[PDB]
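Lab notebook, entry 303. We have the chain sequence and a SMILES string for 4MK, and the next step in the workflow is to get a structural model of the bound complex before anyone spends time on docking refinements. Request logged below.

Task: model protein plus 4MK, output structure tokens.
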Amino acid sequence: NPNYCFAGKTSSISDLKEVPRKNITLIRGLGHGAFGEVYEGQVSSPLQVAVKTLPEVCSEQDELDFLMEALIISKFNHQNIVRCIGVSLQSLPRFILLELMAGGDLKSFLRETRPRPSQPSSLAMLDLLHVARDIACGCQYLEENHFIHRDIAARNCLLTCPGPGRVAKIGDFGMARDIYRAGYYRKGGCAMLPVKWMPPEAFMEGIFTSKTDTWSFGVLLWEIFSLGYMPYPSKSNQEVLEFVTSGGRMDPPKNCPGPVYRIMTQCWQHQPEDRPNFAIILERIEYCTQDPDVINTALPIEY
Ligand SMILES: Cc1cc(Nc2ncc(Cl)c(Nc3ccccc3S(=O)(=O)C(C)C)n2)c(OC(C)C)cc1C1CCNCC1
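Result returned:
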């Protein structure tokens, strides 16, 4: 059985909490993950869960990838990273049971909660700053524990609920799992890499540090403040690659306050040494939340 090391501590399949198959009920499909459907489920006042499934028709590598994902998520202990309730690997199809996030993914939340004439203040600058702070908190925990996420993006973030009081969390570690297992990428190729979220040293030299996550965080900030637009509008992966290597950077999203845009530009410094760490990113987000000129800025209303 493969071993997994995090914060200098080793774990294996035997450390995962196997939950009896009879105690799990699938309710509805929520969409698809990297390799398999994800369901809303219940574990027996039942525990509300997200059920990641492993296709029964899969290779031995798919089975080992699935196990590694369970080990990775089960070893984290942070409020801004989705909890793992357990696994059900002794029955087919195999399951990973995660904390149900009732607000769905962040990208679809921003696109659907965008202020409209119908919803005048669905969302405000403070809601965006709270999502950004929540994710920066999770990234800080990964950085302090020497774990490089490699795929910080809106599609990988989830929300506990749609309304006020929502907490944003990192809910996917598929890229980091792929690198941990083989050392490189892997199952995919050039066309599958998250090019639009990567710094120059990453796509050019294959060099990854916590400053890689800082760059991707800046891109996530743009995704947040644009209200769910795809980064580098109208540019393909190769155009982005060339644009970014030549010093090109995204313009501020529509109505973005200057102090918020300044965080993005700092995250996008060419030299990793010039980029802020997550503690500095958090201090800057915290200062933006205190500033009336930032939080009183109206979000654009989409007609
Ligand atoms: C994407 C999503 C996620 C959830 N909730 C949720 N909670 C926890 C996890 Cl781990 C999770 N995973 C998930 C779900 C769907 C597709 C892929 C994943 S994943 O684990 O592979 C990762 C990309 C988050 N979903 C979700 O939960 C419901 C109960 C609100 C709904 C959705 C969609 C449904 C169709 N409209 C847009 C939102």
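Notes for the group: The chain has two domains: 1-100, 101-291. Worth checking against the assay data. The pocket of 4MK is lined by residues 30-33, 38, 40, 50, 52, 82, 98, 100-102, 104-105, 108, 156, 158, 171-172 (CB under 6 Å).
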